[PDB]
Amino acid sequence: TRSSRAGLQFPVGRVHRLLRKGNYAERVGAGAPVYLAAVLEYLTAEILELAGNAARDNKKTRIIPRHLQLAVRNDEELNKLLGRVTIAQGGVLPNIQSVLLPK
Amino acid sequence: AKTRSSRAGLQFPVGRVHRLLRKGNYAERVGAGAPVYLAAVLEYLTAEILELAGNAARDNKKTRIIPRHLQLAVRNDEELNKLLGRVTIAQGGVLPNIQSVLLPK
Amino acid sequence: NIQGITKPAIRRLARRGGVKRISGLIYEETRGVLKVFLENVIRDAVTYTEHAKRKTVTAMDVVYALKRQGRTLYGFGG
Amino acid sequence: KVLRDNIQGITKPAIRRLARRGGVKRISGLIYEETRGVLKVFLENVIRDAVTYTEHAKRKTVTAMDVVYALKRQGRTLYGFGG
Amino acid sequence: HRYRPGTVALREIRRYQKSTELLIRKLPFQRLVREIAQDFKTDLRFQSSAVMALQEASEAYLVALFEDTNLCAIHAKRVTIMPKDIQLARRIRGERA
Amino acid sequence: PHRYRPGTVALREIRRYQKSTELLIRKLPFQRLVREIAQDFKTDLRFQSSAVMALQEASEAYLVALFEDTNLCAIHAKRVTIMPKDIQLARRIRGERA
Amino acid sequence: TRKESYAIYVYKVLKQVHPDTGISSKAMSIMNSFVNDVFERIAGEASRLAHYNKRSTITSREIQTAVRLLLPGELAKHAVSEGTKAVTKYTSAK
Amino acid sequence: KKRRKTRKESYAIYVYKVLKQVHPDTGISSKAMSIMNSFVNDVFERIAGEASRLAHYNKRSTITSREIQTAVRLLLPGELAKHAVSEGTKAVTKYTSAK
DNA sequence: ATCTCCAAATATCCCTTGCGGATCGTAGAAAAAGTGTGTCAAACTGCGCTATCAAAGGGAAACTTCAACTGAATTCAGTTGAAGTTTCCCTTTGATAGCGCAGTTTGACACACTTTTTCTACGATCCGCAAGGGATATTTGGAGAT
DNA sequence: ATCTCCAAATATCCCTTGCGGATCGTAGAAAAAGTGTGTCAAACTGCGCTATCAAAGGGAAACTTCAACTGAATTCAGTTGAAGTTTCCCTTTGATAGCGCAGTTTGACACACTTTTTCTACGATCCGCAAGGGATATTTGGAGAT
Ligand SMILES: [Cl-]
Ligand SMILES: [Cl-]
Ligand SMILES: [Cl-]
Ligand SMILES: [Cl-]
Ligand SMILES: [Mn+2]
Ligand SMILES: [Mn+2]
Ligand SMILES: [Mn+2]
Ligand SMILES: [Mn+2]
Ligand SMILES: [Mn+2]
Ligand SMILES: [Mn+2]
């Protein structure tokens, strides 16, 4: 498999098939699906790494939507990348505006 | 009638639109009526803007249309303004508008 | 049906938003704002449904509509 | 020669004119630096993308289209310079 | 015993900002959707997940809007959100003209 | 000697600028700022004249619209004077960050 | 090299609408931008619609529902009728 | 047999593997997986759409790792992009080696 | 400040179910092969972008004066929140009724591709001439003052 | 009320420029013509799953009681931003000499892709079992009254 030859867990063949069926361009070079598969892998690795700790902090061995929401929103860059996305069942970061609090 | 536009009773170039759809990788195949419909829709929209910008030009005692006219036309029209709600017309300026509280009393 | 979205329901929503005090006229505004929101999304969703010559509004139909309005939703088929 | 502090070229009167076209009648003296900051972040985001299109085209000259393509990417389409 | 005004409300904020449960009763919300759908196309069915999609999106939207509305209220030295606040939030969002 | 009350010239200034469409920021200064920022991303870049024009048209339209919203935020707070916190409220609701 | 543009067509539609009115260079550049933009927005959606329904071809149908999705209500009714009217007439030939 | 109930297809397993590599003792719910599948499909589409535009803008008929890369620079914010360009470039380097 | 009461967080333990590891068949990725064209390099170039300047003067900068806006301080009618009584319907459990979504199979035909012919549309160069924006003087609407 | 008067508007002479209408030679693309070729509309079909029926309770929605404290209004003054003036900085305008570099051009060919056979990763399906649900108890963090 091309993934192995590339040291990736993500399907380089599938990504290549999807790049050809999506009508992105008349042709797709050989390195494009590899490069894309690697990026996709990195980003999901990045999310799971933080969602996992959220699950840990919340004392749970299983990552649930709420954890992915905390990982995303407490992370500046992931929050930017998903600024227009809504994670179902994610809720919101606990946050009360100072002036609302009692002295 | 030779040209496909001629056949459709259209001013816009059906032939160019069909080619543009083909060279834009939107789908592997483009039906015969796709570029006629699209050319008719594009022709219609420019008629609507030229019309309104044309009236704006006459309101400013003008014979020629400039960006400001297209801007006044677009922003004074609820639909075009929404269609171009995220577009900026170079050299269009804004609509004359002063919040009330700022007016002298 | 618009009244189905009850006052206490609107309070909880505003609470998640972090609202502490709510004027009494907010409930009617929210109902009006929710109706416009649903109308827009459902309008586009039903357009996809009809284009597919179907009579059943699918989750994907909704997700595609939510993506068109710039409100991409994760969890139902993205 | 090294380029420094050019955000200052964006003078007080120029920012004032902008606020007029935008209908503002009274301006706090703290607005000018707030605007320079905001404008800077804005040009940084657009220029950053304009330059990425340039570098990709293996060019050294930022073109009107790189700018136009960059603005479109940021949800701020511009009419009048191509595309 | 009586908790002072705001105290329970503040308590409620902490509670809901910690859970992910939908806050609008399901059946009511479903009727609304069908009524609205009905005004654009008669004779229509809904996959159960379709209705749920709309609710997730509808609530995430209202919740975020209240966050904006609340800031505007606070912007005006107030602690009580009002229509003018919701209206200002939507006007700046570009949701309104 | 004659003297208009404060705010009277402000108003005619709003009408003067709302009627016209010419760029309000001096041209060369804007261009230098653009070249300084690009240069921090890449060195030895050159710009077409129109590329800078486009940037200035986009920047001024952006700022003009930010000031409109900023004013609405000032007015919402029962003021008539825009302040840094009005611009901040405006950018926060717009989802603009950094 | 050559430089395509909708200019000639835009002039044409302008004369039908305002026979004694001209348009400046910059205003035409804007109009050309408008056409290329709306085209992009329409072809783009039609593209998605076809993909969503596992179709290999973009037909006047995908262009139609793309027009209903993109244009504000009213501008769409008219575009839809000018579109349908143009295809109806066109098919009536060959 | 004969009438097979279609056949969906997701990133669920490649996801689960990655979850193991970073959190060996951490599991994942069906809903969260659905969210992760959406994220991947979403990112993929965003990246290819750009590369596609890059290709067109530059009158080129092919989407190479070069269009994937600058598409990544346009789509991803600061640090995430730098890293992503690291993993992609590395994958391509390694992959070509393997003969 | 300190002391009694409420509610959230936390500990404990038994029930529920969806995680997550297995099994089995297969749709799809891979391998060896024969094919051509989009891509890359190398050579040629003139549009135009950078650096520069020389005189003009338009507009920025900085300071004085003070009109009037921001906002601190105070007030109190009453809109709201909290807690208790009353009224209502959403949620949940055991499934039939059958709508209409989706799998199968298929061949006419709508659309792709190719080659030749017809012609549209763009780049270069000329024209009647009103649209037009600047240099310069006078009239006009009304903000501000006697 | 009634006059002084500042800046936008109005009006006259001058002229250069950009625009609508021409007239022209032509590269390149649309059309017309031939014909391969696979996408898709129809058509009978199976069953997933959407709609619907019926009875009961429980907790959420609604209504009631009471007044805490928040929003709106009034008065007031140090603050600070607008208006106008003076000075002269450095943008804007205009012609320029020089080359960096964007963009056209042309043949070698690495590289993507199509067709086909083989090998296999990953999807549909399963069920024990443990993480999480969920109910009752003990602890912990705070608010509100004395
Ligand atoms: Cl490649
Ligand atoms: Cl068609
Ligand atoms: Cl209000
Ligand atoms: Cl401030
Ligand atoms: Mn620098
Ligand atoms: Mn599972
Ligand atoms: Mn001056
Ligand atoms: Mn049936
Ligand atoms: Mn007078
Ligand atoms: Mn104890």
mmCIF file of all heavy atoms in Angstrom, chain E residues 38 47 54 57 64 76 83 87:
data_model
loop_
_atom_site.group_PDB
_atom_site.id
_atom_site.type_symbol
_atom_site.label_atom_id
_atom_site.label_comp_id
_atom_site.label_asym_id
_atom_site.label_seq_id
_atom_site.Cartn_x
_atom_site.Cartn_y
_atom_site.Cartn_z
ATOM 1 N N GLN E 38 -43.877 22.722 5.640
ATOM 2 C CA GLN E 38 -45.174 22.663 4.974
ATOM 3 C C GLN E 38 -45.505 23.911 4.153
ATOM 4 O O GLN E 38 -46.217 23.834 3.152
ATOM 5 C CB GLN E 38 -46.253 22.428 6.029
ATOM 6 C CG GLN E 38 -47.675 22.394 5.513
ATOM 7 C CD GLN E 38 -47.875 21.343 4.465
ATOM 8 O OE1 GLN E 38 -47.350 20.233 4.569
ATOM 9 N NE2 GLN E 38 -48.647 21.676 3.445
ATOM 10 N N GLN E 47 -36.518 12.591 8.032
ATOM 11 C CA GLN E 47 -35.750 11.526 8.644
ATOM 12 C C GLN E 47 -35.638 12.006 10.078
ATOM 13 O O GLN E 47 -35.525 13.207 10.312
ATOM 14 C CB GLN E 47 -34.360 11.425 8.025
ATOM 15 C CG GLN E 47 -34.350 11.132 6.547
ATOM 16 C CD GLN E 47 -32.964 10.763 6.055
ATOM 17 O OE1 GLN E 47 -31.987 11.460 6.335
ATOM 18 N NE2 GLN E 47 -32.872 9.661 5.314
ATOM 19 N N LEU E 54 -31.485 20.035 12.542
ATOM 20 C CA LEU E 54 -32.023 21.382 12.669
ATOM 21 C C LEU E 54 -32.025 21.893 14.103
ATOM 22 O O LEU E 54 -31.753 23.068 14.340
ATOM 23 C CB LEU E 54 -33.440 21.449 12.086
ATOM 24 C CG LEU E 54 -33.441 21.410 10.559
ATOM 25 C CD1 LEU E 54 -34.800 21.062 10.028
ATOM 26 C CD2 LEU E 54 -32.999 22.745 10.036
ATOM 27 N N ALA E 57 -28.352 22.740 15.220
ATOM 28 C CA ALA E 57 -27.985 24.001 14.585
ATOM 29 C C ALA E 57 -28.794 25.173 15.148
ATOM 30 O O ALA E 57 -28.240 26.239 15.408
ATOM 31 C CB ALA E 57 -28.167 23.910 13.068
ATOM 32 N N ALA E 64 -25.209 31.201 20.794
ATOM 33 C CA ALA E 64 -24.138 32.125 20.409
ATOM 34 C C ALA E 64 -24.694 33.546 20.249
ATOM 35 O O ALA E 64 -24.033 34.528 20.609
ATOM 36 C CB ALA E 64 -23.470 31.665 19.111
ATOM 37 N N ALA E 76 -23.842 48.642 27.078
ATOM 38 C CA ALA E 76 -24.662 49.783 27.433
ATOM 39 C C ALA E 76 -24.860 49.923 28.939
ATOM 40 O O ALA E 76 -25.889 50.430 29.389
ATOM 41 C CB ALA E 76 -26.023 49.677 26.725
ATOM 42 N N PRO E 83 -34.492 43.475 23.339
ATOM 43 C CA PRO E 83 -34.577 43.367 21.887
ATOM 44 C C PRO E 83 -33.549 44.233 21.167
ATOM 45 O O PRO E 83 -32.893 43.766 20.244
ATOM 46 C CB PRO E 83 -36.009 43.770 21.614
ATOM 47 C CG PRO E 83 -36.714 43.088 22.740
ATOM 48 C CD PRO E 83 -35.838 43.436 23.937
ATOM 49 N N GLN E 87 -31.191 42.914 18.331
ATOM 50 C CA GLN E 87 -31.228 43.618 17.068
ATOM 51 C C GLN E 87 -29.859 44.185 16.683
ATOM 52 O O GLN E 87 -29.468 44.102 15.516
ATOM 53 C CB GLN E 87 -32.299 44.713 17.131
ATOM 54 C CG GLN E 87 -33.678 44.144 17.507
ATOM 55 C CD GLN E 87 -34.756 45.203 17.756
ATOM 56 O OE1 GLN E 87 -34.466 46.357 18.116
ATOM 57 N NE2 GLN E 87 -36.015 44.799 17.590
#
